Each structure stands twice: as structure tokens, then as C-alpha cells.
Symmetry: C3
Subunit: 231 residues, 3 copies
């Protein structure tokens, strides 16, 4: 484990995702509202999945070597197995908050799968220049997601209860800022141009992951928007 | 790229799926009917997924070598990753058109997963004679799907609006004819008996894919069956 | 095939899953109740999936070698591909029986995915002591599932029709007893401590699989709880 300088950030990430999972699990014990139960189930699964994948990276299972640039490059593939399941769950939290229609939910989840799937292909591609073709396709899929979150959901939240509109607006802004950083870290990190070393890259993804999952969840599950209007 | 004679058909397929995706995306911009939005989302995702997998084959990522018959045989595995997601989406288009019940939808999607999954196992199997055992199981799963589309959905469409009944009947006939060709191309192509060479096999799958996805989508999204009855 | 002593139990399992699939398929022909169709579709898919994965193990495709303990250990990875899809389908049978809320269904299916996913990682892990870390995480996920089936569903079934309450109680008890045996067989078998040899381990999993899928299905599909109350 300790033979890799980035191990400290993988261990911290593992701990923070595990602690986040347990807090949400305990906090959700005393909840019977069927609407609130939906948000607790979605939001608790997110850091639980991330916990297992951070642990796999810490123990060395989620790491492979990819030859490109005449070098064997360490690629943590477990990140994409994490994101494949956690990013659509996070979008479902937002879509259920605004009572989005089914067709829009399917478009979001499908574009998200394309985003993560093409990012994985780009991470494992051995022809250096082709890695950035996949990065560009994946980034186009992300821009579609961000467009929908702004010019489809925002207008839908305003016609909703005030507390669900204000909570959505906050979580929307958090998501757009944090998610946009991921393609940048990829491009300048060891998967892309190799400007930033792997140990610093790992620290950046850990800060982003914890903020986008645990921080996101703390804002959502403390809001009254997750409960139905009741007397 | 150009070192493979089949590259021209992979490049054409990539272009036609990309163009198809963009047309459906633009055409769906001016749509607010929640029913129509469902069909546009399903139908636009189909060629978008196929685009990415054709590109992976063009660039050489979606290709592996499988030893059988005393030879290293080029097997494009990316086809099955495509079909795993696009064939159930196409069946969902048909099932939603006739307002199929949930139990029937689950049976269709499950049989479809078995069809594609066993076809993938057959494509990667190293014992030559066993490849055709998997082909037979996969073909049995397809025949179940075709039976349901005829002796379960057809009777349901007649009790529906006339425009949804006539549109379903057309898309049903297109699907049964085109899908039935796939097991035949597999059997006589490089995955099976090896009668037809890979470059011709690739041309045939490209014609079938574009027809079953883009051609299918053009018929559906030009129909009024996708809109609810409104004044 | 016959070069492996466990082949006899893989062949028996294949036959019993295939026969089970055909019986459920025939029995479900004469069913039009939309509620009953749901249970028949879920319950017939379970042994059909298991059939294909037992066949892959029989023919040698679903087997790999994992080095640990200074030895190349035969690991049947196809079991986890089976369980990944069949265990959530079995939980869906139970959840639909008691009309569970959506949030609870998602929590069950998500915990089940974590259970199977971490068990697969543990089966393929090359550092011997780490294999049991994954076993423990997977077992914690199972205990969560069992808790929900007892202290969330049981109370919900009592407020239901008597026949659905008594049928659920029976299937609940069958599930908790049979599922609990799996982590024990893993721990003492070739994936874990290696006390029980592989051929005996394979026999035990076959008895458990057939009972948990075909036996489970025979109890459910003979009950009147799967039909709506009708005159
Ligand atoms: C009902 O809706 C509320 C349940 O949602 C919340 C239910 C959760 C979604 C269930 C998923 C958690 C499982 C219990 C998994 C247990 C293993 C975890 C990874 C444990 C990690 C923390 C600890 C080991 C440090
Ligand atoms: C509606 C939305 C959900 C739609 C989703 C969008 C999606 C279509 C976007 C594209 C996804 C696609 C790129 C997934 C590729 C997975 C692949 C990286 C797995 C590893 O295989 C890659 C190479 C080794 O580098 O295999 C070496 C050769 C091996 C012999 C490969 C044989 C196994 C194949 C991988 C079998 C295909 C399985 C499916 C891809 C499983 C789904 C994986 C997940 C990442 C989507
Ligand atoms: C709301 O419902 C309508 C949206 O459906 C339609 C929405 C679509 C389903 C969203 C999926 C498309 C994404 C925007 C993916 C973008 C990358 C594409 C693969 C681009 C391919 C064409 C071009 C690069 C040649
Ligand atoms: C309700 C419906 C959706 C049900 C679906 C029906 C489905 C059950 C039908 C059978 C599907 C099954 C054959 C999928 C097999 C995937 C497999 C080809 C992936 C590549 O692995 C094959 C060998 C190399 O040749 O791995 C070499 C050895 C490696 C060490 C393998 C270890 C990884 C395992 C593959 C882990 C299992 C992952 C799941 C199979 C992922 C789903 C893939 C998709 C193709 C279903
Ligand atoms: C409508 O709801 C009822 C259909 O459910 C029941 C429908 C089933 C869920 C459909 C799935 C079965 C498919 C027909 C697959 C056929 C291949 C099987 C694996 C055959 C195995 C048995 C035989 C080959 C020994
Ligand atoms: C809501 C719920 C459904 C959530 C589900 C819970 C889930 C997150 C729990 C953890 C699942 C995770 C451990 C799955 C790992 C699959 C992995 C074993 C496949 C084989 O790859 C392992 C190594 C060889 O040993 O690959 C060698 C290196 C290769 C180069 C690997 C590159 C391919 C990657 C495997 C791509 C990721 C694909 C996804 C993991 C596909 C889903 C598989 C299924 C088992 C979940
Ligand atoms: C909890 C994890 C989250 C919210 C991860 C989000 C990840 C992304 C938005 C990743 C995006 C990428 C691109 C847009 C292209 C480059 C490759 C990716 C996958 C890093
Ligand atoms: C857009 C792609 C489509 C509609 C693909 C359809 C593919 C099939 C219907 C494939 C069927 C197969 C068999 C029936 C057995 C032989 C292997 C397959 C997977 C080619
Ligand atoms: C039809 C198959 C069924 C119902 C299989 C159930 C399997 C389990 C409940 C497996 C549980 C495991 C653990 C709890 C940890 C050890 C590894 C597993 C996956 C065997
Ligand atoms: C979206 C965030 C990207 C900003 C990356 C900042 C990295 C600064 C760290 C110093 C770079 C290390 C280079 C010298 C080793
Ligand atoms: C009462 C609110 C705080 C509860 C404690 C939460 C502990 C989980 C770890 C959170 C750290 C990361 C927060 C986002 C920066
Ligand atoms: C379902 C369509 C299958 C028909 C295949 C027709 C192939 C004819 C092309 C000529 C065969 C090439 C053999 C000589 C190289
Ligand atoms: C107005 C209808 C035609 C629009 C142009 C569609 C261009 C997408 C490519 C379609 C070619 C394949 C059609 C099926 C044979
Ligand atoms: C949950 C069931 C686990 C019980 C396992 C009993 C196995 C007894 C078979 C004899 C053990 C073989 C050891 C000598 C070869
Ligand atoms: C009339 C009920 C029996 C029908 C025959 C079922 C045959 C399928 C194989 C069942 C054997 C396994 C039963 C569970 C132990
Ligand atoms: C490729 C993996 C995608 C599945 C991720 C799991 C979450 C799915 C959310 C589905 C939302 C409901 C759509 C109607
Ligand atoms: C194995 C991958 C299957 C999932 C394909 C994605 C489409 C799923 C459609 C689900 C239809 C809704 C069923 C109720
Ligand atoms: C185009 C939709 C408007 C909202 C999206 C904001 C774009 C942020 C740019 C992200 C940069 C990634 C490289
Ligand atoms: C048996 C259901 C009737 C409709 C299915 C038509 C069968 C077409 C044969 C396809 C040939 C594939 C080898
Ligand atoms: C803790 C929830 C109560 C019901 C679960 C029964 C636990 C059975 C123990 C299984 C042993 C697996 C190692
Ligand atoms: C080795 C660098 C080659 C540059 C390729 C950049 C491709 C980016 C595509 C974005 C449209
Ligand atoms: C090398 C050819 C061996 C023939 C096997 C055919 C199997 C087909 C099974 C269809 C029932
Ligand atoms: C080689 C045996 C090492 C023992 C590790 C046991 C780990 C079990 C963790 C359960 C909390
Ligand atoms: C609940 C605390 C979980 C912390 C265990 C993971 C941290 C790795 C320490 C080496
Ligand atoms: C929108 C046009 C997309 C065409 C790019 C793919 C074709 C491959 C050319 C080499
Ligand atoms: C319907 C009977 C299915 C039996 C075939 C599988 C058994 C393997 C025999 C070698
Ligand atoms: C993106 C930063 C999240 C901050 C988490 C703190 C929330 C406390 C209510
Ligand atoms: C299967 C052939 C499809 C033909 C596509 C043309 C549709 C234009 C309306
Ligand atoms: C767990 C044992 C199941 C027994 C199956 C027999 C059911 C006949 C109704
Ligand atoms: C109005 C809410 C502002 C939230 C933005 C937070 C950016 C990290
Ligand atoms: C909408 C604000 C985008 C912020 C992008 C930050 C990328 C590091
Ligand atoms: C490929 C772009 C299509 C141009 C608009 C078609 C008419 C909606
Ligand atoms: C009555 C519609 C006929 C459609 C059949 C088309 C076959 C390619
Ligand atoms: C229902 C007509 C079937 C046509 C099969 C064509 C196979 C090449
Ligand atoms: C009251 C029903 C008892 C069922 C338990 C069966 C254990 C195999
Ligand atoms: C609730 C009874 C548990 C039985 C466990 C059996 C494990 C072999």
C-alpha cells in the first residue's frame, strides 16, 4: 500500500466515504415519509458505492497499467466503475426533486452513461492522440447534461413549492461547478497531458468526490424539500 | 486504421450513426408533449450509443483476437456492447407504443439480454463446436421475442388508436425482418462457419444496423402516434 | 469437461435449471391477469439466467485461475454474473408481493449489488488476507438486506390480504435460511479457507441455487397471492 505516494489520499477518501455512509444511514433511520425515503435511499447508496471503490484503489485492486507515450502508466480504472453508478444516482436526486418527466430522466441517465463510458475508453486507449478524441466526446455529453439542468429543470423548479425550488437551485449550482472540474483534472493529469503528477491528481479527485457526494448529500438531506407537504 | 480492409464500412457506419443522432437531436428540440419526449429520448440514444461503438471499432479498440480453428480470429466485441443497450431500447419504443404491461416489458428485456449475452459468449468461445451451442440458445431467445411481438402486442395494438396501430404494425414488420438477418450473418461470417469474409460481413452488419436504428427512428418520429390525443 | 471432478454437479445444475425454466414457461402460458404476469416474468427469468451460467461453467468458459497461497486456484467467476442479476430479481418478487415503496426497493437492490460486487472482488483478489476483508463487507450488505426483509416488510405484509401475508412469510423464511448459507460455503470453500474441496463446494452451491430459485418459484407461482382480488 504505502509504496504508492498517493496512498494517503486514497485512505482519506475511503474513511470520509465510509463515515458519510454511516451518518446518512443513521440519520435515515427515523424516516417514514415515502417521499423522504426515496431521497435517503438514493443519497446513502452514493457514498457506499464510492467507499468500496476507494477501498479497491487503496488495496491495489482497482489499478492497472496502460502503455502509452512509451511508458507503463498507472491508471485507476475503479474510478469509472464508481462514477458509472453514482453519477446517475446523483442526477436522479435532482430530477425527482423537480418531478421531472420520464423522457427527460432517460435522456440524462443515457447521456451520463455515454459520458462515463467514453471516459473509460479514453483512459484505457493505447494510442496517445486518440485518448483526447474520447475526452472530447465525453465532454460533449457532459455539456448536454449541464444544458438540461439549466434550460429544462430550472424552469420546472420555479413552478414548484418554494423550498424545493430554492434547494434545487443550490444543488444545481454545486453540481455544475464541481462536475465541470473533473474533465479538467483528467486532461492535465496522468490520464491526459501528464502536467500534474498522479499523487496531486489523486488529491484533487478526492476533494471533488467528497464534496460532490457527501457535501451534496448533507445539503439535500437537511432540506425540507424531501418531505411531502403534510399537516 | 486503413490496414484493415473493413475500415471503409466502419467509417461509413460511424458517419451515418453520428448524422442520425444529430438529426434526431435537432428534430426533438421543439417538442413539449411528455409522451413524445419519451420516444425522442429513447430513439435518439440508440444511434448515439451505436456511434460510439462504431468509432471504437474504427480506431481498433473494440477488436480482439480469439484462437479457434488453429487461427487467431479477429472478433469485434464492441458490437455486443452496442447491442446490449440499443436492442432493449428499441423494444421499449415498441412496447410503449402499444402501452404494454410491465410484466411483458420485463420478459422482453430479459430475453433480449440473454440473446445478446449468449451471443457474446459464443463469439469469445475457443472450442469451435461450442460456439454454435451458444448461437442456438441465443436464437431461441430471439424467437421468443419475435413470438411476443406477434402474438401479444399485435392484438394489443388493434384495441388502440388507429394511428398507433398502423405505425406499430409497420415498425413490427421492419423489426422482425431485420433482426432475423443478424443470426444468419453471424453463422456464415467470421464468428461462425467463415464462409463470408470479414470485410463483407462488416458491410452487412452496417446496412442492418443503420436500417434497424436510423431507418426505424425516421419512421417512428415522423408518426403522429407518439403524441397524445390533444385538441 | 469430465476432466474436472465437479463436472457432475455442474451438469445436474444445468439440467435442473433448464427443466425449471421450461415448467414455469409452460405454466405461465395460460395467464392474463396483469399482476400475475409480473410474477411469472420475474420468476421465469431467474432459472433461465442461471441455466446459461451453469452451462458456461460446465463447458469451462466461466472458470479462471487466480494465484494466491502460492497456487493457481480455480475460481468459477460465472457464479457472480448469475447472482448479479438473479438475486435482485428474487428480491423484487418479495417486494412486489408486499407492495413495498420505491425507496425501499432501491435500497434493497443497491445493497444487493454491493453484496455481489464485493464478493466478486474478494474472489479475484490475489492478496490472501484481503479476500476476507471483501467477504466481511459483502456479509454486512447481506445483513442489511435480511434486516429489511424482517423489520420493514413483515410489518407491511400483515396489513395486506391474508393470502399474500402467509405466502410472503413462507418465502421470507426460505430466503433468509438459504441465502445465509452462501457466505458460509464461500468462507470454508476454495474461495476462502480451503477446508472443503471444490467438488463438494460445487455440490453445495448447486443444492442452494436450485432450492433458492426453482423451489422458491414453485411456492410462489402456486399461490393465489400473485393474482389480484377479482370476482
Ligand atoms: C428505506 O429507505 C432508507 C434506506 O436507505 C439507506 C439504505 C442504504 C442505501 C443501504 C446500503 C448500505 C449497505 C448496508 C451496505 C453495507 C456496507 C457499507 C459499504 C458499509 C460502509 C461503512 C463502514 C464499513 C465503514
Ligand atoms: C443507456 C446507457 C446506460 C447507455 C450506456 C452508454 C455506453 C454504451 C457508452 C459506451 C460504453 C462502452 C465503452 C463500455 C466499454 C467497457 C469496457 C471498457 C470493458 C473493458 O474492456 C475493454 C478491453 C480492455 O481494455 O477489453 C478487452 C477485450 C475483452 C475480450 C472484452 C470482452 C468483454 C466486453 C467488454 C463485453 C461488453 C460488456 C459491456 C460493455 C458491459 C457494460 C460496461 C459499462 C462500462 C457500460
Ligand atoms: C427531453 O427529451 C428529449 C431529449 O432526447 C434526446 C437527448 C439525447 C438522448 C442525449 C444523448 C446525446 C448526448 C448529447 C451525447 C453527445 C455525444 C454524441 C455521441 C455526439 C455524436 C454526434 C457528433 C459527435 C458527430
Ligand atoms: C435481466 C437481463 C438483463 C439478464 C441478462 C442476461 C445475462 C445473464 C445473459 C448472460 C450474460 C453473461 C454471459 C455475460 C458475460 C460477460 C463476459 C463476456 C465479460 C468478459 O469476460 C469473459 C472472459 C473472457 O472471455 O473473462 C475472463 C475472466 C475474467 C476474470 C472475468 C471476471 C469478470 C466477470 C465478467 C464479472 C461479471 C460481470 C457481469 C457479467 C457484467 C455484465 C456484462 C453484460 C455482458 C451482461
Ligand atoms: C408475459 O409474461 C409471461 C412471460 O414470462 C416468461 C417469459 C420468460 C422470462 C422469457 C425468457 C426465456 C427465453 C425464451 C430464453 C430461451 C432460452 C432458455 C435459456 C431456454 C432454456 C431451457 C432449454 C434450452 C433446456
Ligand atoms: C446500484 C447498484 C447496482 C450499485 C452496484 C454496486 C457496485 C458498485 C459494487 C462494486 C462493483 C465492482 C467491484 C465491480 C467490479 C467488476 C470487475 C470485477 C470486472 C473485472 O475486472 C477486474 C479486474 C481483473 O480482476 O480487471 C482488470 C483490469 C481491467 C482493465 C478492468 C477495466 C474494465 C472495468 C471493470 C470497467 C468497469 C465496468 C463496471 C464495473 C461494469 C459493472 C460490473 C458489475 C460486476 C457491477
Ligand atoms: C462522485 C463523482 C462524480 C460526481 C464524478 C463526476 C465525473 C465527471 C463529471 C467526469 C467527467 C469526464 C469528462 C467530462 C471527460 C473526461 C473524463 C471524465 C470521465 C473525467
Ligand atoms: C441495432 C442493432 C440491432 C437491432 C441488433 C440486433 C441483433 C440481433 C437480433 C442478434 C442476434 C444474434 C443471434 C440471434 C444469435 C447469433 C448472435 C447474435 C447476437 C448476432
Ligand atoms: C440464486 C442465487 C442466490 C440466491 C445467491 C445468493 C448469494 C449470496 C446471498 C451470496 C453471498 C455472499 C456473501 C454474503 C459474502 C461472501 C460472498 C457471497 C457473494 C457468496
Ligand atoms: C480544476 C482544478 C485544476 C487546477 C490544478 C492546479 C494544480 C496546481 C498544483 C501544482 C502543480 C504541480 C506541478 C509541479 C509538480
Ligand atoms: C451536523 C452536520 C455534520 C455531520 C457530520 C458529517 C460527517 C461526515 C463527513 C463530512 C465531511 C465532508 C463534508 C463536505 C466538505
Ligand atoms: C441475410 C443475408 C445473408 C446473405 C449473404 C450474401 C453474401 C453474398 C456475398 C458473396 C459471398 C462472398 C464469398 C466469396 C468471397
Ligand atoms: C427528411 C427525412 C430525411 C432526413 C435526413 C436523415 C439523414 C440521416 C441519415 C439517414 C440515412 C439512412 C436512412 C435509412 C436507410
Ligand atoms: C452451510 C453448510 C456448510 C456445511 C459444510 C459441511 C461439509 C461437510 C462435508 C465433509 C467435509 C469434507 C472434508 C474432508 C474432505
Ligand atoms: C407439480 C409440481 C412439480 C412440477 C415439476 C417441477 C420440475 C422442476 C424441477 C424441480 C426440482 C427441484 C425442486 C426444488 C427441490
Ligand atoms: C449503466 C448503468 C446505469 C444504471 C445506473 C443505476 C441508476 C439507474 C437510474 C434509473 C432512473 C430511472 C429511469 C426511469
Ligand atoms: C443488461 C442491460 C439492460 C438494460 C438496458 C437499458 C434499457 C432498460 C429498459 C428498461 C425498461 C423498463 C422495464 C420496467
Ligand atoms: C452549455 C450549457 C451551459 C451550462 C454549462 C456550463 C459549461 C461549463 C464549462 C465546463 C468546461 C469543461 C471543459
Ligand atoms: C415463432 C414466432 C413466429 C415469428 C418469428 C419468425 C421467425 C423468423 C425466423 C428467423 C430465422 C433465424 C435463424
Ligand atoms: C440482523 C438482522 C436479523 C436477521 C438476520 C439473520 C442473521 C443470520 C446470520 C447469517 C450468518 C452469515 C455469516
Ligand atoms: C497528441 C495531441 C494530438 C491532438 C489531438 C486533439 C484532439 C482533440 C479533439 C477535440 C475536437
Ligand atoms: C463443428 C460442428 C459441430 C456441430 C454442432 C452443432 C450444434 C448446433 C446445436 C443446435 C441444436
Ligand atoms: C490470513 C488471515 C488474516 C485474517 C484477516 C481477517 C479479516 C476479517 C475482517 C472481519 C472484520
Ligand atoms: C469507519 C471508519 C472507516 C475507516 C477505514 C478505512 C480507512 C483506511 C485506514 C488504513
Ligand atoms: C458529423 C460527421 C461525423 C463524421 C466523423 C466520423 C467519420 C470518420 C471519418 C474518418
Ligand atoms: C431440457 C434438458 C436440458 C439438459 C441439457 C443440459 C444437461 C447437460 C448434459 C451433458
Ligand atoms: C460543496 C461544499 C459542501 C459544503 C457541505 C456543508 C453543508 C452543511 C449543511
Ligand atoms: C427499413 C428501411 C427504412 C427506410 C427509411 C426511410 C423512412 C423515410 C420516412
Ligand atoms: C426450499 C425447499 C423448497 C421445496 C419445493 C417444493 C415446493 C412444492 C410446492
Ligand atoms: C446561491 C447558492 C450558491 C451555491 C454555489 C456554491 C458553489 C460551490
Ligand atoms: C458555471 C461555473 C463553471 C465553473 C468551472 C470551474 C472549472 C474548474
Ligand atoms: C443534421 C442537422 C439537421 C438540420 C435540421 C433538419 C430540420 C429539422
Ligand atoms: C405493411 C408495411 C410493410 C413493411 C415491411 C418492410 C420490410 C422491409
Ligand atoms: C418474417 C419474414 C422473415 C424474413 C427473414 C429474412 C432473413 C434474411
Ligand atoms: C412457516 C414456514 C416455514 C418455512 C421454513 C422452511 C425452511 C427451509
Ligand atoms: C434464521 C435462521 C438462520 C439459519 C442459518 C443457517 C446457516 C447455515
Amino acid at each position: 500500500i504505502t509504496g504508492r505516494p498517493e496512498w494517503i489520499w486514497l485512505a482519506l477518501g475511503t474513511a470520509l466515504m465510509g463515515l458519510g455512509t454511516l451518518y446518512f444511514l443513521v440519520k435515515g433511520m427515523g424516516v417514514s415519509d415515502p417521499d423522504a425515503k426515496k431521497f435517503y435511499a438514493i443519497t446513502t447508496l452514493v457514498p457506499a458505492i464510492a467507499f468500496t471503490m476507494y477501498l479497491s484503489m487503496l488495496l491495489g485492486y482497482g489499478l492497472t497499467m496502460v502503455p502509452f507515450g512509451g511508458e507503463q502508466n498507472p491508471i485507476y480504472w475503479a474510478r469509472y466503475a464508481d462514477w458509472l453508478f453514482t453519477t446517475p444516482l446523483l442526477l436522479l436526486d435532482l430530477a425527482l426533486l423537480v418531478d421531472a418527466d420520464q423522457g427527460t430522466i432517460l435522456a440524462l441517465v443515457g447521456a451520463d452513461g455515454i459520458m462515463i463510458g467514453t471516459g473509460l475508453v479514453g483512459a484505457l486507449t493505447k494510442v496517445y492522440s486518440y485518448r483526447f478524441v474520447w475526452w472530447a466526446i465525453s465532454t460533449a455529453a457532459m455539456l448536454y447534461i449541464l444544458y438540461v439542468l439549466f434550460f429544462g429543470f430550472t424552469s420546472k423548479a420555479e413552478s414548484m413549492r418554494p423550498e424545493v425550488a430554492s434547494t434545487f437551485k443550490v444543488l444545481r449550482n454545486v453540481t455544475v461547478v464541481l462536475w465541470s472540474a473533473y474533465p479538467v483534472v483528467w486532461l492535465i493529469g496522468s490520464e491526459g497531458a501528464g502536467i500534474v503528477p498522479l499523487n496531486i491528481e489523486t488529491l484533487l479527485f478526492m476533494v471533488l468526490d467528497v464534496s460532490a457526494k457527501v457535501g451534496f448529500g448533507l445539503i439535500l438531506l437537511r432540506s425540507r424539500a424531501i418531505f411531502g407537504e403534510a399537516e
